[PDB]
Amino acid sequence: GFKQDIATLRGDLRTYAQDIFLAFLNKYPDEKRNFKNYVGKSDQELKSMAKFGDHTEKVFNLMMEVADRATDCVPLASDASTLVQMKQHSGLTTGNFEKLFVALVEYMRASGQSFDSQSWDRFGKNLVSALSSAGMK
Ligand code: HEM
């Protein structure tokens, strides 16, 4: 289920993190404009850029902690506030996070592994709701 999925992803996190984030950037090409130096690069070129590997790993390291601390796929309000107050996320909206979780769920459904994709769909929706209550537009 959800808790085991966290362990599965953490077991090979750098690979899953890059694959899922690329699936997100390729399903929603306009999201690349939020990052410097991503436009005009193929997947393999992005994976060889230092800031891509660093950001993607940090995103998933923290996302797995937020998921680990959640109850019934509902994140802690404190975790949502932390994500809102990051200066890095100034200018972002709940829509950016919504699209990331759509790509993540689609990736799980196509992987063929025993992911609990329905619980991750709920988690993404519940996280977006928490971000809104925390102050994100
Ligand atoms: C669960 C969701 C997310 C988590 C946990 C997360 C986490 C993080 C963390 C920890 C950093 C700073 C890393 C460091 O200081 O080394 C960061 C930076 C950043 N994040 Fe997020 N992030 C999430 C979603 C997103 C989304 C959806 C976007 C854009 C669509 C985004 C865009 C950025 C940008 C632009 C930066 C700083 C500039 C850069 O690294 O290129 N993040 N994020």
Side-chain angles (χ1 to χ4, degrees), residues 1-50 52-86 88-117 119-136:
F2 187 71
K3 284 295 244 193
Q4 177 54 33
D5 289 352
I6 298 170
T8 297
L9 296 165
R10 284 176 161 160
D12 204 7
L13 196 53
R14 193 167 188 87
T15 301
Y16 281 120
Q18 291 188 346
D19 282 356
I20 295 169
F21 211 81
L22 289 166
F24 159 67
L25 296 176
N26 286 317
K27 182 178 185 73
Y28 303 100
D30 293 328
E31 296 287 324
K32 278 198 177 183
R33 302 201 233 290
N34 290 282
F35 303 90
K36 304 201 282 282
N37 236 10
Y38 282 23
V39 178
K41 304 301 201 327
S42 67
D43 288 3
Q44 297 297 105
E45 287 169 310
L46 284 170
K47 289 196 246 170
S48 291
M49 291 168 62
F52 175 87
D54 289 335
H55 175 246
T56 61
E57 186 141 54
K58 264 89 184 309
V59 167
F60 276 81
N61 282 344
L62 183 51
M63 192 204 286
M64 293 304 97
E65 290 190 30
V66 175
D68 212 359
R69 288 190 284 265
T71 297
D72 280 0
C73 302
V74 177
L76 294 174
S78 58
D79 276 324
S81 288
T82 293
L83 288 170
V84 169
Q85 292 169 9
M86 286 166 64
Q88 283 64 235
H89 293 163
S90 99
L92 293 186
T93 73
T94 49
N96 306 99
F97 289 78
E98 185 181 332
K99 293 178 176 63
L100 173 62
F101 279 94
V102 172
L104 181 141
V105 171
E106 285 192 7
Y107 175 91
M108 288 179 167
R109 275 167 189 165
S111 72
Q113 313 164 230
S114 50
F115 286 116
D116 185 358
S117 62
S119 291
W120 289 96
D121 191 55
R122 287 166 46 211
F123 175 67
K125 278 155 159 87
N126 295 335
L127 180 62
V128 165
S129 176
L131 292 171
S132 185
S133 295
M136 185 172 287

